[PDB]
Amino acid sequence: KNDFSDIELAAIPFNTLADHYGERLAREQLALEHESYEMGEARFRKMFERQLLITTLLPKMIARINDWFEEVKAKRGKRPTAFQFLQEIKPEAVAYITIKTTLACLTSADNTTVQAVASAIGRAIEDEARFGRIRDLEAKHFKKFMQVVEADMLSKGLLGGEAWSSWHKEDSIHVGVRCIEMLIESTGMVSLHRQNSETIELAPEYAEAIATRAGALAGISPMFQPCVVPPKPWTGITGGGYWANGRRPLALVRTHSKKALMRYEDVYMPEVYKAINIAQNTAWKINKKVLAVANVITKWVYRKDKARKSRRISLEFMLEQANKFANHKAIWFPYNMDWRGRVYAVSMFNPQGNDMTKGLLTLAKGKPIGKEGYYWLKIHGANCAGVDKVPFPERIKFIEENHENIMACAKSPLENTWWAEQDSPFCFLAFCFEYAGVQHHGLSYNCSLPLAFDGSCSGIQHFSAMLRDEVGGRAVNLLPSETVQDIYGIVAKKVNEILQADAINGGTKALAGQWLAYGVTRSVTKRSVMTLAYGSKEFGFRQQVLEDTIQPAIDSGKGLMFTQPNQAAGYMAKLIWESVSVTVVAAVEAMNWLKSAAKLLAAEVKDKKTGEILRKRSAVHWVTPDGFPVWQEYKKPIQTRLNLMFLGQFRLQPTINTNKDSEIDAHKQESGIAPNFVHSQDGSHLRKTVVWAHEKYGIESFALIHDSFGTIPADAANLFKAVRETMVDTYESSDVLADFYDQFADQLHESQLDKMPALPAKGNLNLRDILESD
Amino acid sequence: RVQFKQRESTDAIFVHCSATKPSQNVGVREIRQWHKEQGWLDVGYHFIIKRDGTVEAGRDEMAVGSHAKGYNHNSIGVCLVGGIDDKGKFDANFTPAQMQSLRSLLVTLLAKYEGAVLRAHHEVAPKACPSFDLKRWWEKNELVTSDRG
Ligand SMILES: [Hg+2]
Ligand SMILES: [Hg+2]
Ligand SMILES: [Hg+2]
Ligand SMILES: [Hg+2]
Ligand SMILES: [Hg+2]
C-alpha cells in the first residue's frame, strides 16, 4: 500500500504492457488513459496548426484560469475556498477537465444542476490532484488478437489503491462552481437557467454547433474510454481494467461510500472474479459499414424537447468515439459491478447503449456459422424487426418472405429506408449486412455479429426451478420442453375467459362489459405480470392498469365504456392476480415468502418485556451462490443547505445531498428486500453461466446487454445448453431457498423473532434434467 | 454462508471479553447483531463461550477475522461471555464451568498450531479485555480480576 517509489510505480504499468502486448501499444494505452485529465501539447499543436470547438474553448479557458490565478494573488486579505485547491494543479488540466466534464454532464436529460455539474468536475480535479505526479512522470516514460490477461503475473505495484475521494462534499462543490464560472466568462459555452438550478443549457451558439456541423467534439472525449489492449484482470477490490498508475483506480463494486466498498476486502469469492474477468477479455471492433451509414443519416413538447437537446450531445459523443477506433483491429471494455451484482461496462461508449451504439459495434473474432449459426442468425434478425411474439418456425419465414428486401438494403440510403422502419433500425441494419455476407461467402465465413436473445421473464423462471412447479416453469417458455408460447398472452385468456364466464353471468362485478366493450388483449395483462417484485399484489396492478390502459383511453375518447375509473382498474387487478396465482404458482408463493421474511429481518424487537430484549433497526444482508455478498442499508439523509451568490448576481442556495450521519429508513428497507434480491439473482445466474460457457464449452467472446447475452452465431447454440445446464446445476446441487431461509433466520432475535414463514412446498417438476433438451 | 480468505498462518490465540453483565446470556447470535451494527458481514470472533459453558463456533477456524487489530491476519480470537460488573467496570466474573471450556479449547488449539502463542487483548490494547490476568489463570487455576497478565 505504497511499498515502491513514485517512479517504480510510473514504471511497472508501462514495462508490463511493453513486455506484454508489445511496445507501440504499451504507449498507446497509457497515452489514451491520460486523456482523461489533460489533452497534451503534442495532440494539440498537430491539431491547431493542421487546420491553418476545440482550439477555441481550451485557449480562452487556460487564460481565465491564469488571469484569475494571480488576480486573487493581489496579496490582499481574503483567500477564496478554491484557491489552494486549484493551485498546484496545472491549469492545462483544469481548463480541460472542466470543458471535458461539463459536456459529459449535459448528456443527462435527467439531472443537470449546478450542484451536480459542479460536484462532477469537483471529483476530477482531485483525482488529478492526487495522481498528478505519478502521472506526469509515467508520461515522461515517453513522449506524449492478443490475450493479455494474466492471473498472477501482475507486478505487485499494479494492485489498485484508494478509489474513494477524500475532499469534503461542500468543498468539492466550490471548486467545481469556480471552474464552472471561469468557463462561462472566458467562453460563453453554458449558462444558468431559472436562476434564483439547470446548468444544462448550451448557449444557442455552441448548441447549433455540435448538432449542425462537421464533428466539433474532435478533441473532447469521454472521461472513460475503451482499451486498445486487454484490460487488467481484477483481484482485490480496486485497480482493475485499466493500467495507468498515474490515475484514479476503479472499484470492483460501485458503492455509496468507501466504507461500503471496504467490506468486500476480506471476502473470498473466485467465481466472481472469474466471471467479471472473462467478460472483460471479449474482443470487439467497430462495424464500419453501419458506421458509414450512421455517419450521414445523423445529419439529414416542452417536456420532450429537453431530451432532444441532450440526446444530441450523446449522439455526437458516441460517433466521435466509434470513428476514433474505427480502424483498430480490436478494442476492449473494463467492467464493474452494482451493489446488487450487475456487471456494468465502465466507458461511456460501450456495447450497452441505444441501438445505434449497439449496431456500431461487433465481436472482433469469428467462427464459421454453418447450418445452425445461419439459423439463429435468422431467428435473431426476426426479433430485430419486431417479429418476436410469434413462434420460431413462422419466425424464420418472415425473413425469407422478405429476402430481396433485406438485400435491397445493399444501398442503405438510396430508398431502402425499410430498415429504419423497424423497431431498432441499426440493431437491424447490421443484421442485413451480416445476412448479405452469408449470401456471398457461404456457410463457411467466420461471421462475428453478437446475437442476443431476451426471455419473457427471469425470476418467474428461477422460482419455478427453485420450487419445482411445472405449469409455470412451462408457461415462461423456458424451463421444460414445449412449443414457445407467451405467458403474457396466457394470462390474458384467463382474464377474459373469467370475465364473460361468471362476471356477466354472475359491487358492479358486471364490469365484464366495460372491459369487453373495450377489449382485453395481451397488451393489457403483461405490464404487471412482469412486475412480480417492486410492483406487487393486485394493489399494484390497479395503478398500473389504471395508469397504462384505462386513463390513456379516456384521453383520446376511446374508453367511453369506463364510466367509473378506479373501480374498473381494481376489478382487473383481482382478475390479473387470480390468473397469475394459477399460471405461475411458485413465483407468487416465493414472493410472499420473501415479503414475509422482509417484515422480520427489518423490524425492531417486539418484546415489550423490557429486558435484554432489543434489536436495532439495522442493515439486512445476503449471499448469492457464486459467493458475492449483498449489503442493503437504506439510510434517511441528514443535510444542511449551502449559500452561493458568486457570479456577481444570481443567489443560489442548493441542498447538500447529505452529510453521511444517517439513521435507517424502515420503509424502504422492508419494501426493498424482495426486488433487490431478485435482481441479485439475475446477477448471479449470468456470472455463473459465463464461467460455465467458457469452461464446459470453451466460448471466448461474450456480449452482455441489459441482461441478455450472446456470442457469435457459431457458438449461439451452445450458450443455450450452457444456460439450461447452469439452472439445473444450481437447484439440484442444493435447496437454495432452504439455505436463504437459514441465512435470514441467522439475522433475527434469539427465538422471539424466529416466527419465520414456512418455506413454500415444492411441486413436481420433471426430473430437472427434463429442463434441458436432454 | 459468506466466506473469508485464509490466514497464511496462525501465530497467536487471543482472549477478549464482551462488556456484558452476568444477567445477559448472550451468544454468537447476539454478538453478531452487535457486529452487523458495527458494520460487518459476520461475527469477528472464531469461538465464543456462553455463560453456560457452551462453545459456539463463529467464523471458520482458519479465517482472517475481525477481533484483534493489526493482528487479524494471523490469529484466533475467543470472546468470553461476561466481563463487566453490574454497572461498573471490568470484573473477572466468568463461570468456573466456562473456564474449563476455555481450558480444553486452548490446549487443543495450542497443540494443533505448534508455535502458536496464547495472548490477551489488554496486552496490546489500551482496553480491559479479557479483563483478567490470564497468565495467572493459565499457570495457576487462580482467576483474578485485573488488566495485566
Ligand atoms: Hg454530472
Ligand atoms: Hg437487434
Ligand atoms: Hg458474415
Ligand atoms: Hg420480466
Ligand atoms: Hg472485554
Short mmCIF file of C-alpha atoms in Angstrom, two decimals, chain B residues 14-19 38 40 45 67-71 83-84 89-90 120-133 146-149:
data_model
loop_
_atom_site.label_atom_id
_atom_site.label_comp_id
_atom_site.label_asym_id
_atom_site.label_seq_id
_atom_site.Cartn_x
_atom_site.Cartn_y
_atom_site.Cartn_z
CA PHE B 14 -6.28 -14.05 21.79
CA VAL B 15 -8.87 -13.98 24.57
CA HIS B 16 -11.15 -10.89 24.62
CA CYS B 17 -14.43 -10.32 26.59
CA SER B 18 -17.78 -8.73 25.85
CA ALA B 19 -18.69 -5.91 28.23
CA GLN B 38 -20.60 -2.41 13.88
CA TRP B 40 -19.69 -6.40 9.36
CA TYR B 45 -14.53 -13.94 16.51
CA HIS B 67 -11.05 -9.35 16.56
CA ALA B 68 -7.52 -8.10 17.49
CA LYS B 69 -6.42 -5.39 15.11
CA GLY B 70 -3.19 -5.34 13.21
CA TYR B 71 -3.32 -9.00 14.21
CA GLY B 83 -16.56 -9.42 31.97
CA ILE B 84 -18.33 -6.32 33.28
CA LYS B 89 -16.00 -1.80 35.28
CA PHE B 90 -14.04 -4.95 34.43
CA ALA B 120 -4.65 -11.23 25.75
CA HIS B 121 -6.06 -8.09 24.15
CA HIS B 122 -5.24 -5.89 27.15
CA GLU B 123 -1.66 -6.86 26.26
CA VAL B 124 -1.57 -4.84 23.04
CA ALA B 125 -4.55 -2.57 23.63
CA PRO B 126 -5.46 0.33 25.97
CA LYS B 127 -8.61 -1.69 26.79
CA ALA B 128 -9.55 -4.14 29.58
CA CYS B 129 -10.12 -7.37 27.67
CA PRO B 130 -10.33 -10.16 28.66
CA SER B 131 -10.45 -8.05 31.87
CA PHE B 132 -8.46 -10.64 33.90
CA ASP B 133 -4.87 -11.68 34.47
CA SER B 146 -7.06 -7.28 36.57
CA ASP B 147 -5.78 -5.58 33.43
CA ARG B 148 -2.33 -7.15 33.44
CA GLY B 149 -1.40 -10.73 32.57
#
